[model samples]
Target chain A: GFLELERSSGKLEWSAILQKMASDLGFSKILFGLLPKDSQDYENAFIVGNYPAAWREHYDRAGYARVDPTVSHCTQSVLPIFWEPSIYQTRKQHEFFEEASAAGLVYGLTMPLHGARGELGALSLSVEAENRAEANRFMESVLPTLWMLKDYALQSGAGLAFE
Target chain B: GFLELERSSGKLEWSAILQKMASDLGFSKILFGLLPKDSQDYENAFIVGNYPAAWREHYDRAGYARVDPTVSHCTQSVLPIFWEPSIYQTRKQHEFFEEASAAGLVYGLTMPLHGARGELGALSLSVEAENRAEANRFMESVLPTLWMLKDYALQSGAGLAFE
Candidate 1:
C-alpha cells in the first residue's frame, strides 16, 4: 500500500508515502479512519498493524461505536488529543479498556485530522504498555504528514483509499 | 449584540486593563468559558486571578468540565497552566500543596495567560513546591504571555464571549 501511494502520479504522492515513514518510526500499528461529512460518524478504511481480531470484532458487535468517547470528543475539537484508560473516568469506558487489556491491547494514541469541511479524520497507534511519551513523538513526527495527507485528500476529493 | 460592539466599547475595555495589570504582575489569568460558540452548554472560565461567580457555578454544575484535558493539558503545553493539573505526567499539576492537599488538586507552578480568539489561553506562574521538579516552571511562566501577545496581534476581529 505504501509503495502504491508513493508511486502514484498524483498531486501529492508524498502524502501517502508518509504513512510508511510513520510506521518506520516505531508506531506498531496505525489505523486512519475518516469521519462522515458531518464530522460525527467514522468509517475505517485501513488497518496498518496489529490488534486482536476478537477485540475488534467485539467492539463492532457490541455497538461500542455510539459511546466511543475518543472519537466523540475529537469530532467536536480541533486540537490533537491523547486518550488513555487511566485518564478516562466513565465506568463503561473503563470497562471497555479492561476488556481490551485482557485481549492484549493496551496503550494507544488517537490523533484527529479536522478537514476544511466538517469532515474529520483520525490516526491511531497502539502498543503493549503505558507509553504515553510516544504521544509527543507521534505529534512531532506524524502530525505534519497526516496534515498534508488530509490537505491532499480533501483537495483531490478522494476517499481514504488504501492503494 | 455584535452590531452594538463599537457602541459598547466598555464591555471589552477590561481587556486592556487586564493586559496592563498582567504586565505589571509579570502575568495574569484570561478567564473564558469552555463552551463552543453560541452554545448554552456554558462551562468554566478562569484566566488565573479570576473571581467570577460564573466560573465557580460552571465548575460545580458541569462536573464533566473539570476533567477537561484542555484545562489540564494547558499546563503541559508550551504556555503555562497555573492552578490546574498538568497535562503531562512528568509535571506536577498544582503548586500550593496546602490548597491541593485540601482540594485534591495536584501541586505545581502557576501558568500565565496565553490563549486568544476564543481559544484556551496560555497560563504560567512561579511555584514554591518541589514535587514538580520535572515540570518547566520558568519557561511556562513566560511562554503563555508571549502566546497571548502573539495571538492578540494576529487576531482577525472580535472573538467569542464567555457565558
Candidate 2:
C-alpha cells in the first residue's frame, strides 16, 4: 500500500513526499512541527517545512513562536484549524498575522496530530489564493490527505528527533 | 480522555456529546455518515446528524446524493473539505447548493474519516455565519474536537451497521 511504502521511507523522503503533496494541494508552503509532550517550549521542538527563508529567519529572530496563535491553539487540541485574521483578538496576535501575511504566508490550514506518548505535532499548509472561494476549495480538497500524512509522519518517526 | 469516555459510552450518548460539541462550536447542524468502503454507493450508509428534517427528506426524494460534490469528493479521499458555492460547477450541483442554502445550511466543513478495514465515513458540520471570517473561525475552533469525536463514533459503531 502507499502508506506502507511511506512508512518504510526515511525522513528526507517523507519531507519530499509531503512537499509534493502540499504543492499539489495548492499550498505554497507546508510546516510540520513536533512539540514536546512535557512542555510548551518550541525551542526544542522538531520543525520542518518549505517556508520562505527570509520569513523563517524573521520568525525565529522575532521569537514569534511564543505568541503565534496557530501554535498556541494547535498545542492545546488535535483539531484542524483554518487560518483567519479575525481570530487574532489581541494586538500582538494581530501584529503577528500582519507580519505573516506580509511574508506571503497569506492563508493556512493547521492540523494538530497527537501521538501515543503524549507527543504533539502540527502540519500547517499555507498558500496564496486568488480569492476566498478558491482558498476554501483547496483547503477542502487537501484536508484528508494532510491528516493521513500527519499520522504517517509521526508513526514513521520522520524528522521528529531534530534539535 | 474525552475520546476514551466517548468510546466507552453508548451510541445515543456519544451522539449527544457530539451534538453538544457542535453546538458549542457554533454549528447549527452536524451530519455524520459511514459509507461502505468497497463502493461509492451511499444507500447503505449509516447516518446520524441534526440536519433539518425537511431538508433531509427533500434530499432523499430529489436523489441529491448521487450528484453531491461533497459525497463524491469525500468517498475518494480523506481530506477535510469546506463547502463553497463555486465548486458546484454543474447546474444540478448549483441547484443542490441553492436548496441547501435555502434550508439554512449556509456554510459547512466536511471531513472524510478512514478506518482500518477500509471503512469510509464523513463528519460534516454546517452552520449559518454572519460572514466568511466568522465561519472560518468557527471551523478552526471546532475541528480538533470534531476529529476526535469522529474517531470515537466509528470505534463505537454508533450507526455503521446496515442491511
TM-score of chain B of 2: 0.84
Worst ten in a row by lDDT for model 2 chain B = B154-163
Return model 2's CA RMSD, one decimal.
15.0
Best by DockQ: 2
- Per-prediction interface RMSD in Å: 12.8, 10.3
Q: What DockQ do you compute for every candidate structure?
A: 0.02, 0.03
lDDT by residue (A21-109, candidate 1, tens digit) is 55565555555555444433335333332445777789878776666667666544433446565556787787777776687656566
My TM-score estimates for the predictions, one after another, are 0.41, 0.51
Candidate 2 per-residue lDDT over residues A98-155, each given as its tens digit: 9988988878877765543445677788878977678888877766556556656654
* Model 1 residue A159 lDDT score: 41
Query: Each prediction's Cα lDDT score?
Result: 0.44, 0.70
Clashing pairs in 2: A79-B144, A140-B81, A143-B79, A143-B80, A144-B78, A144-B79, A144-B80
